[PDB]
């Protein structure tokens, strides 16, 4: 799961991105689930820093 893939997937679900975990990127293999860290839930979505405001966790498939 590259930083590239995580960044591109965020733009894929930009409207859906939320405090809860996202669908797993992948249907065959391994990817990542992303969420907005509770501490940053009232931040605009264009102002979100990819490192310090996004919680990322791998998903096995």
């Amino acid at each position, epitope marked *: 799961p*590259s930083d*590239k893939h995580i960044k591109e997937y*965020l*733009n894929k679900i930009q409207n859906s991105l939320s405090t809860e975990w996202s669908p797993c990127s992948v249907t065959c293999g391994n990817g990542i689930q992303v969420r907005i860290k509770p501490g940053s839930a009232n931040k*605009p979505k*264009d*102002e979100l820093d*990819y490192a310090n405001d996004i919680e990322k966790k791998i998903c096995k498939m």
Partner: antibody, heavy 120, light 108 residues
Framework: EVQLVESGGGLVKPGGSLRLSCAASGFSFSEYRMNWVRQAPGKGLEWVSFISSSGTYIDYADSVKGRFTISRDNVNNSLYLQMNNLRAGDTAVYYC?????????????WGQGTLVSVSS | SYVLTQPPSVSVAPGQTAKITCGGNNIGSESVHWYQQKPGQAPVLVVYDDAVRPSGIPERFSGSNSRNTATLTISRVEAGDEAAYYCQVWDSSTVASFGGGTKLTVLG
């Protein structure tokens, strides 16, 4: 159902100043990053400035740093660019572009542009 | 700021497929976008995030980004595709950055 119409282009003396406007309609202006992109005649596109949904985050290309100042009015859904101490290289067609993307960003919608011409 | 470098001109006959390259060392690690600017009009985003297309853009336009070369392929080229094409990157860690532009020419 989404449009961006720039205004304020004209002629100005070197060292003078101008202020461009971009009037946005058809999308909730207050929750989108806006940008200015200019293009000198016969040359390529050049990013100039960006302002975030609220105005907390602001950056400029080194080209225009210190002389230009971007601002937005989210009540009237308008974007502005105050350009001071203009030089010849500032001559170009200025576009206002809507920004999209979080970590890697793009310009999805563009206005037709306004021409700024700095000449003695 | 990431520097992108595109060929100045690119020619091809009608109905053939044209490839417009956007080069940079390890550009494959960056997410590239593409714009069409026909003479007098505003740019139009044809492809974002390397290969995804916005609504309305025909399937003829395709983007890939491998190693040191991003490529916007245009298949079954029509005369109307005659325009300028600019690749662009903007990772949130730096500022935006455009290529020099490639003038597509459909050969008559």
């Amino acid at each position: 159902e989404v449009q961006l119409v720039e205004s304020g282009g004209g002629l100005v003396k070197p060292g003078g100043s101008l202020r461009l406007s971009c009037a946005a309609s058809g999308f909730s202006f207050s929750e989108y990053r806006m940008n200015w992109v200019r293009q000198a005649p016969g040359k390529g596109l050049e990013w100039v400035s960006f302002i975030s949904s609220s105005g907390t985050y602001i950056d400029y290309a080194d080209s225009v740093k210190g002389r230009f100042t971007i601002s937005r009015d989210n009540v009237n859904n308008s974007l502005y660019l105050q350009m001071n101490n203009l030089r010849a290289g500032d001559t170009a067609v200025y576009y206002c572009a809507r920004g999209m993307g979080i970590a890697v960003r793009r310009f999805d919608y563009w206005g037709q542009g306004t021409l700024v011409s700095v000449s003695s | 700021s990431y520097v992108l470098t595109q060929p100045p001109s690119v020619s091809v006959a009608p109905g053939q497929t044209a490839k417009i390259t956007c080069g940079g060392n390890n550009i494959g690690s960056e997410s590239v976008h593409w714009y069409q600017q026909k003479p007098g009009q505003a740019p139009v985003l044809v492809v974002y995030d390397d290969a995804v297309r916005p609504s309305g853009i025909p399937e003829r336009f395709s983007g890939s980004n491998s190693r040191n070369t991003a490529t916007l392929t245009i298949s079954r080229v029509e005369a109307g595709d005659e325009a300028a094409y600019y690749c662009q990157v903007w990772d949130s860690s730096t500022v935006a950055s455009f290529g020099g532009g490639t003038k597509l020419t459909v050969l008559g």
